[PDB]
Structure formats: structure tokens, C-alpha cells
Amino acid sequence: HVLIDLLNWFRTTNMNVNNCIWALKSSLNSMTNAK
Amino acid sequence: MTDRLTQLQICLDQMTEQFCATLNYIDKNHGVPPEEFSNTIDELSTDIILKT
Amino acid sequence: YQYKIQELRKLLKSLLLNYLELIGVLSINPDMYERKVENIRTILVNIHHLLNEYR
Amino acid sequence: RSNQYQRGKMHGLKQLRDSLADKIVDEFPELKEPVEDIIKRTS
Description:
This is part of a larger assembly, with chains A, B, C and D.
Chain B: H1 4-29, H2 34-51
Helix pairs in contact in B: 1-2
Chain C: H1 2-28, H2 34-54
Helix pairs in contact in C: 1-2
Chain D: H1 2-27, H2 32-42
Helix pairs in contact in D: 1-2
PDB class: transcription
Keywords: Mediator, Gal4VP16, transcription
Entry title: Mediator-PIC Early (Core B)
């Protein structure tokens, strides 16, 4: 579980970062209209 | 001649585009060598200051 | 009109300051970054209002 | 690889905001005081 817990936590961080990047891209795409 | 209000709109649009490009570069480049990244960001920040 | 000019200048300075603080938020704790993003937009939106009276 | 990417991007962002704070202090001394508070708001 030790390796499993570290593994799952690092995975969660990874796709949280990926989701943040995608949200940034979506926000810029949406807000380009208001530019 | 170009009216200065149209120039102001062009300037603000260019400023918005420059911020979008700078943040896109930051998002897609964070992680490129640190020295080249820092130099490019210094150039971008100088561009921000000049546009201001 | 000088009041509007100085309001616009201070709003631009505050917009730059808030952009710096928001990118710092993205740097350290991006999970709540949007909490400031729309805020900055409001100032930008206010700028548009500041254009409306100048028309 | 993901952890190394995270650490590298954290270092990059740290240097980004350090340089931006330094230059904002330089060309805009009147906004120097909030900028440090911004660091206090972030760090």
C-alpha cells in the first residue's frame, strides 16, 4: 500500500496538473472572444 | 492618417494578444533549458513593459 | 476629465499588479487560480465602462 | 518523469515571478510595497 499510496498520490497530482493546463487553454479560448 | 482612438484599440488588442501568447508560452514551456526560458521570458517582460 | 484619466492610470497599475499576483497564484497554488482570474476581468470590464463615458 | 516535470516547472515559475517582481519594483517603485505582499500572499 505504501508504494500504492505514493503511486496514486503522484498520479492524482499528474492529472490535476494536466486538468489545470486544459482549463487554462479552455479559459483562453473562451476569453479570446472578449478580447 | 490614422485616428488615435483606432490606434488605442489596436494597442490594447495587441497587449491582450501579447499577454495571451506569453501565458501560452509559460504553460507550454514550464518544466526547455532554464537559461533559454529565462532569457525568452525577460524578452517577453520587456515587451510587456514597452507595450505598457 | 483629469479624474477619469487618473482613475484609468491607477486601474491600469492595479491591473498589472493583479496580473502579477494571479500568475504568482498559478505558480504556487494554481488550483484556486480562477478565484482571481474573473476578478481581473472585472477590472478589464470596468475599463470598458470607463470607455463608455469617454465616447 | 511527472515529478521531475513538476519540480522543473515549479523552479521555472519561481524564477519567473522573482524576475517579474524585481522588474516591477525597478520600473515601478510606487508599486513595490504590494508586490512583496503579493509574495507574502503567495509564499
